[PDB]
Amino acid sequence: LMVKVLDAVRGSPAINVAMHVFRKGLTTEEEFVEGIYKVEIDTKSYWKALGISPFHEHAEVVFTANDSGPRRYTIAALLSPYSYSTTAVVT
Amino acid sequence: LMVKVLDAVRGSPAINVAMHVFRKGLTTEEEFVEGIYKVEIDTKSYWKALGISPFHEHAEVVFTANDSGPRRYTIAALLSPYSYSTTAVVT
Amino acid sequence: LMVKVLDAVRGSPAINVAMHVFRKGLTTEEEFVEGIYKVEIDTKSYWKALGISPFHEHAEVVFTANDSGPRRYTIAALLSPYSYSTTAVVT
Amino acid sequence: LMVKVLDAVRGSPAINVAMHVFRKGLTTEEEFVEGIYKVEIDTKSYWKALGISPFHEHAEVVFTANDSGPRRYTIAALLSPYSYSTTAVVT
Amino acid sequence: LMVKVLDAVRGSPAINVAMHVFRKGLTTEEEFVEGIYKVEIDTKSYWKALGISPFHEHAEVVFTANDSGPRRYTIAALLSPYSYSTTAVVT
């Protein structure tokens, strides 16, 4: 097994490289690679893995999730390598 | 097994490379690669994997999910390598 | 098994490469590659994998999902490499 | 097993490299690599893994999640190496 | 097993390198690498792993989470090595 990437480079490129070589109870995950170059923006979660036997008997639950409001996410060149260029965010 | 990628490069390119080589209980996931160059924007989740035997007997549940509001997501060049170009977000 | 990609490059191209080589209980997934260059925008989920025996006996459940509101997602050049070009988002 | 990356470089490129070589109870995760080049912005979570037997009998729970307000996230060149370029955030 | 990265370099590049070589009870995680080049901005959490048997009998719980306010996060060149460039945040 031989891998060659970008043997010779000349003249200033913008590069993003990711190399992975592999060889060979509510939740159980084993022997994994999570999140190479992962981006998460405005992620939400409610009631994850409460456990064994929640609200087993005679439970009265009221759940209300409200999401609102003025929120802004201005992004230029996300995960976007560039060269000899111009990037501007003018407001 | 031999792999060659981008042996000779000249003149400043913008590149995104991803190489993967492989060889050989509510939830169970094993021996996986999750999220190479993954992007998530405004992801939501409710009541994931509450567990074994939730609300087993005589449960009175009221669920209400409300999503609203002024929200903006302005993105230029997502996962988009570029060269000798112009990117602008003018407001 | 021999793989050759982009042996010689000259003059600044914008490139997106993805190479994959392979060789050989509510949920169970094993030995997989999930999400190479995956993009998710405004994804929702409700009540995923509640578990074993939820609401087993005499359950009174009221479910209401409301989705509304002024929301904007302005994107230029998603997963779209470019060169010698112009990208603008003017508002 | 032999790996060669960027054997010869000349002329000032901007590079992001990630190399990974591998060889061979509510929650249990073993022998994993989490978060190489991971970015998280405005992530929320509620009631994660409350434990064994929460609210077992005669529980009266009121849950209310409110999210609002003027919030801004202005980012230029996220995970985006560049060279001979111009990046500006003018307000 | 032999690994070679950036054997010869000339002319002042800006580089980010990450190399990883591997060889071979509410929560239990063993033998892992968490957070190489990890960035977290404005992350929140509520009620994580309260323990064994919380609110076991006759519990009356009122939960209210409010998030609001004018907050700003202005970032230029996050995880974005650059060379011969210009970065400015003008307000």
Would you write up a description of this structure?
- 5 copies of one chain form a homopentamer.
- The first copy, chain A, is mainly beta and 91 residues long.
- Chain A has one domain: Transthyretin/hydroxyisourate hydrolase domain (Immunoglobulin-like).
- Helices cover 0% and strands 53% of the residues of chain A.
- Chains in contact: A-B, A-C, A-D, A-E, B-C, B-D, D-E.
- Chains A and D meet through strand 1, strand 2, strand 3, strand 4 and strand 5 of A and strand 1, strand 2, strand 3, strand 4 and strand 5 of D.
- Strand 11 of chain D pairs parallel with strand 11 of chain E.
- Chains A, B, C, D, E: This is Transthyretin.
- Chains A, B, C, D, E: Its main location: secreted.
- Chains A, B, C, D, E: Belongs to the transthyretin family.
Which assembly state applies to the chains in this document?
A: homopentamer
Described by the principal axes of the CA atoms, the overall outline of chain A is flat
- What is the CATH class designation of chain A? Mainly Beta
**Helical proportion of chain A, percent range:** under 10%
Assign the CATH topology of chain A.
Immunoglobulin-like
C-alpha Rg of chain A (nearest Å): 23 Å
Number of strands of chain A: 12
The most extensive interface between chains reads: A-B, 91 and 91 residues
Under the CATH scheme, the architecture of chain A is: Sandwich
- β-strand percent of chain A reads over 45%
